[PDB]
Amino acid sequence: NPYPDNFYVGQAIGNGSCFFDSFRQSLEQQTGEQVTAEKLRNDCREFAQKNPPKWFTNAIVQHRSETVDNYTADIMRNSRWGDPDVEGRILCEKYKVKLHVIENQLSLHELIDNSGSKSAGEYNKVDYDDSSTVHIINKGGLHFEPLLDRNKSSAKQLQEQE
């Protein structure tokens, strides 16, 4: 309903990594780039180890150095669920994509890129024909599923969905 009729809600793994798995699936369909959910967590670990800019330390917090070190361990655990505002921003920067989240609350559209998170308004309308936007749906909390495009899915993938 809050998306065009060629899009559908896919399935994500439910071991705590649904954010990473939803991002991975939309990334692969949109750009062809295959990255495992574990590799996406490792990209966030590496971001935190490599002189991260202040937005990141500000978001997750001397005390800063231990907090970053705790993050580098915790982000590799499936128990740590991913957050579009933090891990999504890191992955948008690495993969040169914009992340569109459909949030239920009515449906609100958020767009995240390497510079942070904004509501999709008149100047930042969601573009469902842009191969550099990836799409996920957030039913509540930090629960995510990929929003995929039938036009870009194999017939077998679509039968597995049905």
Numbering used by the authors: 36 to 96, 104 to 147, 154 to 210
Wording from the paper:
The ovarian tumor (OTU) family of deubiquitinases regulates diverse ubiquitin signals in humans. We have predicted and validated a set of OTU deubiquitinases encoded by several classes of pathogenic bacteria. By determining the ubiquitin‐bound structures of two examples, we demonstrate the novel strategies that have evolved to both thread an OTU fold and recognize a ubiquitin substrate. Our new bacterial OTU DUB structures allowed for the first cross‐kingdom structural analysis, from which we established a framework for identifying evolutionary adaptations in the S1 substrate‐binding site that impart DUB activity. This work establishes the OTU fold as a common tool used by bacteria to manipulate host Ub signaling and provides insight into the origins and adaptations of the OTU fold across eukaryotes, bacteria, and viruses.
The wMelOTU structure exhibits a pared‐down canonical OTU domain architecture with a central β‐sheet supported underneath by an α‐helical subdomain, but although additional α‐helical content typically sandwiches the β‐sheet from above, there is very little additional support in the wMelOTU structure (and EV3B). The core of the OTU fold that contains the active site (the central β‐sheet and two most proximal supporting α‐helices) closely resembles other OTU domains such as OTUB1 (1.6 Å RMSD) and vOTU, whereas the surrounding areas of structure are more divergent (Akutsu et al, 2011; Juang et al, 2012). Two regions of structure near the S1 substrate recognition site, encompassing 6 and 7 amino acids, respectively, are missing from the electron density. The structure confirms our prediction and mutagenesis of active site residues. However, the catalytic triad is misaligned as a result of the loop preceding the general base His (the so‐called His‐loop) occupying a descended conformation that would also occlude entry of the Ub C‐terminus into the active site. Thus, while the apo wMelOTU structure validates our prediction of an OTU fold, it raised new questions as to the mechanisms of substrate recognition. Our structure of wMelOTU shows that its sequence topology matches the most typical OTU arrangement seen in OTUB1 and vOTU, and we would predict BurkOTU, RickOTU, and wPipOTU to be similar as well.
